[PDB]
Amino acid sequence: TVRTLTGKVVSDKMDKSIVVLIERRVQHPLYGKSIRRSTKLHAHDENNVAKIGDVVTIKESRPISKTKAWTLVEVVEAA
Amino acid sequence: MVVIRLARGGAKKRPFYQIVVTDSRNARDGRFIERIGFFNPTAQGQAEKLRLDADRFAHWVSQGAQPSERVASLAAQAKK
Amino acid sequence: ARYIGPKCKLSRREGTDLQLKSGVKPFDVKTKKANKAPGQHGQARGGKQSEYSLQLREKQKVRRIYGVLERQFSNYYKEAARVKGATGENLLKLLESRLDNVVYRMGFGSTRAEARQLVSHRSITLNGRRVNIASIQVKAGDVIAVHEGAKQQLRIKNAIELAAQRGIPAWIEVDHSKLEGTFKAAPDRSDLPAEINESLIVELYSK
Amino acid sequence: ANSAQAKKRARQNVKARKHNASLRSMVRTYIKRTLSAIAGGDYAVATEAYKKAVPVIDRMADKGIIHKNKAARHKSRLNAQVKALA
RNA sequence: UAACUGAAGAGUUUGAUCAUGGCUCAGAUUGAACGCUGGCGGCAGGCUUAACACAUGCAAGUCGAGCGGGGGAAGCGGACCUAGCGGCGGACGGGUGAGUAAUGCUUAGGAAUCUGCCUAUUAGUGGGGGACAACAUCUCGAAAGGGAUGCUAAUACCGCAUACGUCCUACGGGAGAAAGCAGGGCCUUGCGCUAAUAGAUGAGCCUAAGUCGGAUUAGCUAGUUGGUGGGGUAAAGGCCUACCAAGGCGACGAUCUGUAGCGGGUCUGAGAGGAUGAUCCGCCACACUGGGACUGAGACACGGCCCAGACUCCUACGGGAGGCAGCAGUGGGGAAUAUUGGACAAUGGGGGGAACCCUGAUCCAGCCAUGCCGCGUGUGUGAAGAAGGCCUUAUGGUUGUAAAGCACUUUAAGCGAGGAGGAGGCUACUUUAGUUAAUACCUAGAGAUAGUGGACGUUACUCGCAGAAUAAGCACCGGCUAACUCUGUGCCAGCAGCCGCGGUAAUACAGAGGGUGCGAGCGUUAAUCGGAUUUACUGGGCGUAAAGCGUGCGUAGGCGGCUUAUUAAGUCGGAUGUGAAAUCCCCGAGCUUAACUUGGGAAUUGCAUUCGAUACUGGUGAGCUAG
Numbered sequence A: 001t002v003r004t005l006t007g008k009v010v011s012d013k014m015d016k017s018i019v020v021l022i023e024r025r026v027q028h029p030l031y032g033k034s035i036r037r038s039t040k041l042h043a044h045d046e047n048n049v050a051k052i053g054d055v056v057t058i059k060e061s062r063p064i065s066k067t068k069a070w071t072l073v074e075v076v077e078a079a
Numbered sequence B: 001m002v003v004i005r006l007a008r009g010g011a012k013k014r015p016f017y018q019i020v021v022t023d024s025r026n027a028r029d030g031r032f033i034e035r036i037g038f039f040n041p042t043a044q045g046q047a048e049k050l051r052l053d054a055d056r057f058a059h060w061v062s063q064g065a066q067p068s069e070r071v072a073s074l075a076a077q078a079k080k
Numbered sequence C: 001a002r003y004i005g006p007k008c009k010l011s012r013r014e015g016t017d018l019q020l021k022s023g024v025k026p027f028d029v030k031t032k033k034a035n036k037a038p039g040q041h042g043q044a045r046g047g048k049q050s051e052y053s054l055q056l057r058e059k060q061k062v063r064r065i066y067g068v069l070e071r072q073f074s075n076y077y078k079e080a081a082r083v084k085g086a087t088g089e090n091l092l093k094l095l096e097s098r099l100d101n102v103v104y105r106m107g108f109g110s111t112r113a114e115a116r117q118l119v120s121h122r123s124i125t126l127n128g129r130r131v132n133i134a135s136i137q138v139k140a141g142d143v144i145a146v147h148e149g150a151k152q153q154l155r156i157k158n159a160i161e162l163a164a165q166r167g168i169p170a171w172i173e174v175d176h177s178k179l180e181g182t183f184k185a186a187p188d189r190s191d192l193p194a195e196i197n198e199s200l201i202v203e204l205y206s207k
Numbered sequence D: 001a002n003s004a005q006a007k008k009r010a011r012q013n014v015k016a017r018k019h020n021a022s023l024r025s026m027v028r029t030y031i032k033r034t035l036s037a038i039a040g041g042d043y044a045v046a047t048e049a050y051k052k053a054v055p056v057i058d059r060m061a062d063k064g065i066i067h068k069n070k071a072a073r074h075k076s077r078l079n080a081q082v083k084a085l086a
Numbered sequence E: 001u002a003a004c005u006g007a008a009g010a011g012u013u014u015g016a017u018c019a020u021g022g023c024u025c026a027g028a029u030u031g032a033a034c035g036c037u038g039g040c041g042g043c044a045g046g047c048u049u050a051a052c053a054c055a056u057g058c059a060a061g062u063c064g065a066g067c068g069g070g071g072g073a074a075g076c077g078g079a080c081c082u083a084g085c086g087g088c089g090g091a092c093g094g095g096u097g098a099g100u101a102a103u104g105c106u107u108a109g110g111a112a113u114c115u116g117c118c119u120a121u122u123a124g125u126g127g128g129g130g131a132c133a134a135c136a137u138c139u140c141g142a143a144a145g146g147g148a149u150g151c152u153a154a155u156a157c158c159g160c161a162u163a164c165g166u167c168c169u170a171c172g173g174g175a176g177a178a179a180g181c182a183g184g185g186c187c188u189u190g191c192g193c194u195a196a197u198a199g200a201u202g203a204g205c206c207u208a209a210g211u212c213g214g215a216u217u218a219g220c221u222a223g224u225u226g227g228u229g230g231g232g233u234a235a236a237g238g239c240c241u242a243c244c245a246a247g248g249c250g251a252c253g254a255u256c257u258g259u260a261g262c263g264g265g266u267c268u269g270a271g272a273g274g275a276u277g278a279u280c281c282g283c284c285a286c287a288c289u290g291g292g293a294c295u296g297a298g299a300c301a302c303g304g305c306c307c308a309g310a311c312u313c314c315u316a317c318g319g320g321a322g323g324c325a326g327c328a329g330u331g332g333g334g335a336a337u338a339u340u341g342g343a344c345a346a347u348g349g350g351g352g353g354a355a356c357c358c359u360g361a362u363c364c365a366g367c368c369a370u371g372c373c374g375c376g377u378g379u380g381u382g383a384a385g386a387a388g389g390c391c392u393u394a395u396g397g398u399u400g401u402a403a404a405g406c407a408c409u410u411u412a413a414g415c416g417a418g419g420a421g422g423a424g425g426c427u428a429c430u431u432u433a434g435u436u437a438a439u440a441c442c443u444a445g446a447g448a449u450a451g452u453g454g455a456c457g458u459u460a461c462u463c464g465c466a467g468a469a470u471a472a473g474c475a476c477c478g479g480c481u482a483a484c485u486c487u488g489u490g491c492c493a494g495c496a497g498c499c500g501c502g503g504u505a506a507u508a509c510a511g512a513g514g515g516u517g518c519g520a521g522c523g524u525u526a527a528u529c530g531g532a533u534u535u536a537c538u539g540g541g542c543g544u545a546a547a548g549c550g551u552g553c554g555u556a557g558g559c560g561g562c563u564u565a566u567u568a569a570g571u572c573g574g575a576u577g578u579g580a581a582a583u584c585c586c587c588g589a590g591c592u593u594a595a596c597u598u599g600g601g602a603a604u605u606g607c608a609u610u611c612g613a614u615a616c617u618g619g620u621g622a623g624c625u626a627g
């Protein structure tokens, strides 16, 4: 009962904090083709494990700062 | 306070009441939590005069609700 | 509102009888201008009558047979187009279930514009109660019966003769004895005329 | 105030405000004495400035002048600063 | 069993034709307005413009069973009233849409929170102090309102004691409450008060994705993005602060600018869409303009406080008062929108032990064809085809069974009589549980006799009475488009949605006779969708009608050969929660019918969670050679 998202690390330049980019394929309302949509989430690191180019699973939590409400769960495929 | 009262919607001079469980601060015909029956004081012919679901009435009374003096008389008029 | 004016003037425009002015020596020989349209250039020459005049003409004929104004008739059509039968004969069913029409077939009253004078005037007892609305739908089993308070006025004794000699349909179980009706179910589209064409009315109300 | 009870309520508001300000001031005063003993660095003077503040703070959180969740916080954060003296 | 049923075209470019392409028309709808006309009832609706300024009344009180003082009637005691202290209410209910383009709203989910009254369960309520109003004397002021000085109760205030559980803890210990009143016989119930838990309810906070234009707006940010210590909050958090680091957002439109309350829904359409957000329900925001905090369980408070602005008002010039976007009402603006009404009888709300008091919420009534629905303004006969009018071949034709005359009827309006329902209850008088010394008191329940309680209200409805008596208009008649003639006028006067009529036979102007359509209404103007496949997803085009950039090359992007293994994101299936009520639709029940109200369903095919299926598209690995 804790929803998670999987996405590509795109920045790590900050202490104890990554920025994941999540991508989503969504069908268009009137013309119904398909679209690529993306959202960047500021998530919370603790030991600074994740690096730019990595793909990680994050989960929701209480706020940690102004614009940070997701916590890292694992590095699913380190690369 | 949660209460159980009558909400009045019918027509002019011929009213029809819903029996409704609600916070007592809301408007008489406004927001409510649950409806548990109805009351028709005129009720000609083949039309019902009262219908009160009583298991939900007991549930809410035991949760702390306060029936009005008309709904407390109609809950004794029913089951009879 | 009703129509209160020349009765047979509307019979010459439509070319049929329209069943007004009921009388023992009508035979539609009470105008002698019959089959000639009204007014100055009545039947001056031929008429184009192109595909909207024929629809409107037959709709007017139906309306004038029963005495229904346009708003109520439009409502009838809208209700008939909603039932899950076929819009055509639902309309004639709805029009033959009125009160004044049912009470006109039963013999009380000669013309429908006097069956209405009887119903409206509180002289009919449907299911034991004096109703005075002329368009009440009469359902299967309604007992139509004259009010005991006026079974003497001599407007009825001739109406009950003219009723005889004439039809006695297969859906009203009348008896001109104690004046009690017992309406059956409604009729179907084989007990009323077949000149009345209603495939044009459905297309008139759908332009 | 266009009513009798409206200005009676205004009148009581003023007494209540005067009476509450004294007690809030009283709580802040003792928190200040404990804090200015924690600056000194004397573990003993500090544990004696803390034992004279806790009852005032709890008495005033019982009357409703502060919230009890706020007195609990003041107690905890002021005990965790004299335990770290010695 | 039903809850589905669905789609029309016409006129106008030419001497004629086919195409293209605009313009116009026939439909539905409205919080409408105007013009001509106007009998009734039932249901609704009624400032869309100036969030413009507001005279007058009313819209929030209640408790003497918390507490002193008083007062007047009545027979020195009973009853009764209330200025002041104190409790609770005043944060609901009612209005309005200025601001707000996302700190809002909708859909689906979360933590880190508080919560008066109410229900349940636990431990209590011990003993003392010092004040202040009222009051009694001074006292400044025209008034409003203060000023001095003494005197006082309390469920007002503050110590002390004791705490099942509650708070902090370094697990050793430490800290912290409260108040009485009433009815019957110190003992009994009630009503309260304290501490705690957890339920109800109600509020605060977080996340993701949706929510109107503009690039003739491309860079924006410096508590800005992150971290550590401290402060702060009911509670997570740059919410605040000092340091350290430097970041964060932006062509998937940031920043800037314009407009705008949002949804359930409403109108239209075969659908897909398109317009819209009055009346009813939910949420947000605001209260003369801007800035604050107080009290409280809750407010940054419409009829509360402070201080800034404007603005109005009184004045004795000393000094003060105020906020209709609450209901009525006034002025003003406008094309345009109602009474300075009744009752708390019913449903709710506040206070009270109750009696009962308050309630412009509400229930009702007045005004208005504003809409929807229903009824009436009579019914039969009646050929001397009367007269009159209009046309005319002068004889006829039409108005026309139409009218008279004769025979009837009396719905609704009117005048008299009867008369439900909306009131369940309460007070007395008996009797049985109930806890208790107790058959007192006090909570409950059974019974017939009475008493009392409706604003609407001359109620609905019923039954009588007199007499056709009291009751028909508006648009049109060249085509489109149902329906034609005469006279007057002579490109004049005029008409007109489009084509177009009018210059001496005008079916097109004006009147008249006849006709057509609707009918207590009928026409015009305005606005939305349709027709319009005329922005085309469903569902169009680009040689010559409007339309292929002068030509390459290339960035983001879109799309991409064949075989195989795997994955399971798109895709497909099932299950579970959700999708408020009302509304739409379908059965069927009350209104004499109908509008209308209402029972049950169906629908809300969207969202999320979870379990599966792998053909196709994507990802990954491994191969191939037709590009």
Ligand SMILES: [Mg+2]
Pocket (backbone or CB within 6 Å): A066, E237
């Ligand atoms: Mg925040």
Ligand SMILES: [Mg+2]
Pocket (backbone or CB within 6 Å): D005
């Ligand atoms: Mg008071």
Ligand SMILES: [Mg+2]
Pocket (backbone or CB within 6 Å): E082
């Ligand atoms: Mg008093």
Ligand SMILES: [Mg+2]
Pocket (backbone or CB within 6 Å): E097, E261
């Ligand atoms: Mg607004």
Ligand SMILES: [Mg+2]
Pocket (backbone or CB within 6 Å): none
């Ligand atoms: Mg106290």
Ligand SMILES: [Mg+2]
Pocket (backbone or CB within 6 Å): none
């Ligand atoms: Mg103590």
Ligand SMILES: [Mg+2]
Pocket (backbone or CB within 6 Å): none
């Ligand atoms: Mg005490």
Ligand SMILES: [Mg+2]
Pocket (backbone or CB within 6 Å): A065, E227
């Ligand atoms: Mg931090």
Ligand SMILES: [Mg+2]
Pocket (backbone or CB within 6 Å): none
């Ligand atoms: Mg901190």
Ligand SMILES: [Mg+2]
Pocket (backbone or CB within 6 Å): none
């Ligand atoms: Mg910090």
Ligand SMILES: [Mg+2]
Pocket (backbone or CB within 6 Å): E253
């Ligand atoms: Mg932009």
Ligand SMILES: [Mg+2]
Pocket (backbone or CB within 6 Å): E260
């Ligand atoms: Mg606006």
Ligand SMILES: [Mg+2]
Pocket (backbone or CB within 6 Å): none
């Ligand atoms: Mg279409």
Ligand SMILES: [Mg+2]
Pocket (backbone or CB within 6 Å): E296
């Ligand atoms: Mg309070």
Ligand SMILES: [Mg+2]
Pocket (backbone or CB within 6 Å): E296
């Ligand atoms: Mg406070």
Ligand SMILES: [Mg+2]
Pocket (backbone or CB within 6 Å): E301, E304
């Ligand atoms: Mg207020």
